[PDB]
Coordinates of N, CA and C in Angstrom, one line a residue:
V1 N 12.8 3.0 -7.0 CA 12.5 1.8 -7.7 C 11.1 1.3 -7.4
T2 N 10.2 1.1 -8.4 CA 8.9 0.7 -8.3 C 8.6 -0.6 -9.1
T3 N 9.5 -1.0 -9.9 CA 9.4 -2.2 -10.7 C 10.5 -3.2 -10.4
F4 N 10.2 -4.4 -10.0 CA 11.2 -5.4 -9.6 C 11.1 -6.7 -10.4
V5 N 12.1 -7.5 -10.3 CA 12.1 -8.8 -11.1 C 12.3 -9.9 -10.1
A6 N 11.5 -11.0 -10.3 CA 11.6 -12.2 -9.4 C 12.8 -13.0 -9.7
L7 N 13.6 -13.3 -8.7 CA 14.8 -14.1 -8.7 C 14.6 -15.6 -8.5
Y8 N 13.5 -16.0 -7.9 CA 13.2 -17.3 -7.6 C 11.7 -17.5 -7.8
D9 N 11.3 -18.8 -8.1 CA 9.8 -19.1 -8.0 C 9.3 -19.0 -6.6
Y10 N 8.1 -18.5 -6.5 CA 7.4 -18.6 -5.2 C 5.9 -19.0 -5.4
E11 N 5.4 -20.0 -4.6 CA 4.0 -20.4 -4.7 C 3.2 -20.0 -3.5
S12 N 2.1 -19.3 -3.7 CA 1.2 -18.8 -2.7 C 0.8 -19.9 -1.8
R13 N 0.7 -19.7 -0.5 CA 0.1 -20.6 0.4 C -1.1 -20.1 1.1
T14 N -1.5 -18.8 0.9 CA -2.7 -18.2 1.5 C -3.5 -17.4 0.5
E15 N -4.5 -16.7 1.0 CA -5.3 -15.8 0.2 C -4.5 -14.5 0.0
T16 N -3.5 -14.2 0.8 CA -2.9 -12.8 0.7 C -1.6 -12.8 0.0
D17 N -0.9 -13.9 -0.2 CA 0.3 -13.8 -1.0 C 0.1 -14.2 -2.4
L18 N 1.2 -14.0 -3.2 CA 1.1 -14.0 -4.7 C 2.1 -15.0 -5.2
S19 N 1.7 -15.9 -6.1 CA 2.5 -16.9 -6.7 C 3.2 -16.1 -7.9
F20 N 4.5 -16.4 -8.1 CA 5.1 -15.9 -9.3 C 6.3 -16.8 -9.7
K21 N 6.7 -16.6 -10.9 CA 7.8 -17.4 -11.5 C 9.0 -16.4 -11.5
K22 N 10.2 -17.0 -11.4 CA 11.5 -16.4 -11.7 C 11.3 -15.6 -13.0
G23 N 11.7 -14.4 -12.9 CA 11.7 -13.6 -14.1 C 10.4 -12.8 -14.3
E24 N 9.4 -13.0 -13.5 CA 8.2 -12.1 -13.6 C 8.6 -10.8 -13.2
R25 N 8.0 -9.8 -13.8 CA 8.1 -8.4 -13.4 C 7.0 -7.9 -12.5
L26 N 7.3 -7.2 -11.5 CA 6.4 -6.9 -10.4 C 6.4 -5.4 -10.0
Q27 N 5.3 -4.8 -10.0 CA 5.2 -3.4 -9.6 C 5.0 -3.5 -8.0
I28 N 5.9 -2.8 -7.3 CA 6.0 -2.8 -5.8 C 6.1 -1.3 -5.4
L29 N 5.0 -0.8 -4.9 CA 5.0 0.7 -4.7 C 5.7 1.0 -3.3
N30 N 5.6 0.1 -2.4 CA 6.2 0.3 -1.1 C 7.2 -0.8 -0.8
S31 N 8.5 -0.5 -0.9 CA 9.5 -1.5 -0.6 C 10.4 -0.9 0.5
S32 N 9.8 0.0 1.3 CA 10.5 0.8 2.3 C 10.9 -0.1 3.5
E33 N 10.0 -0.9 4.1 CA 10.2 -1.7 5.2 C 9.4 -3.0 5.1
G34 N 9.8 -4.0 5.7 CA 9.1 -5.3 5.8 C 9.8 -6.4 5.1
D35 N 9.5 -7.6 5.5 CA 9.9 -8.8 4.8 C 9.0 -9.2 3.7
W36 N 7.8 -8.7 3.7 CA 6.8 -8.9 2.7 C 6.3 -7.6 2.1
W37 N 6.4 -7.5 0.8 CA 5.9 -6.4 0.1 C 4.7 -6.6 -0.8
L38 N 3.8 -5.7 -0.9 CA 2.6 -5.8 -1.8 C 3.1 -5.6 -3.2
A39 N 2.8 -6.6 -4.0 CA 3.3 -6.6 -5.4 C 2.1 -6.9 -6.4
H40 N 2.3 -6.3 -7.6 CA 1.4 -6.5 -8.7 C 2.2 -7.0 -9.8
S41 N 1.8 -8.2 -10.4 CA 2.6 -8.7 -11.5 C 2.2 -8.1 -12.8
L42 N 3.2 -7.4 -13.4 CA 3.0 -6.9 -14.7 C 2.9 -7.9 -15.8
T43 N 3.7 -9.0 -15.5 CA 3.7 -10.2 -16.4 C 2.5 -10.9 -16.4
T44 N 1.8 -11.1 -15.2 CA 0.5 -11.8 -15.2 C -0.7 -11.2 -14.7
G45 N -0.7 -10.0 -14.1 CA -1.9 -9.3 -13.6 C -2.4 -9.6 -12.2
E46 N -1.9 -10.6 -11.5 CA -2.3 -10.9 -10.2 C -1.6 -10.0 -9.1
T47 N -2.1 -10.0 -7.9 CA -1.7 -9.1 -6.9 C -1.6 -9.8 -5.5
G48 N -0.6 -9.4 -4.7 CA -0.4 -10.0 -3.4 C 0.9 -9.7 -2.9
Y49 N 1.1 -10.2 -1.6 CA 2.4 -10.0 -0.9 C 3.4 -11.0 -1.4
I50 N 4.7 -10.5 -1.5 CA 5.8 -11.4 -1.9 C 6.9 -11.3 -0.9
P51 N 7.8 -12.3 -0.8 CA 8.9 -12.2 0.2 C 10.0 -11.3 -0.5
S52 N 10.4 -10.3 0.3 CA 11.3 -9.3 -0.3 C 12.6 -9.8 -0.7
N53 N 13.1 -10.9 -0.1 CA 14.4 -11.5 -0.5 C 14.3 -12.2 -1.9
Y54 N 13.2 -12.2 -2.5 CA 13.0 -12.9 -3.8 C 13.1 -12.0 -5.0
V55 N 13.3 -10.7 -4.9 CA 13.3 -9.8 -6.1 C 14.5 -8.9 -6.2
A56 N 14.7 -8.4 -7.5 CA 15.7 -7.5 -7.9 C 15.1 -6.4 -8.7
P57 N 15.8 -5.3 -8.9 CA 15.2 -4.1 -9.5 C 15.0 -4.3 -11.0
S58 N 14.0 -3.6 -11.6 CA 13.7 -3.8 -13.0 C 13.3 -2.5 -13.6

């Protein structure tokens, strides 16, 4: 799986994380380990780390 869906809204608090809305679709190439994964929003075009407990497969 390389495309995920946001289950909850999240608002960035730093330069390295990514704000997204529930239902946004996110390309995540490495979901192997970590509580934070690098994501690219297909829905909006922005990029950054997201909390792994906030997404589902898409």
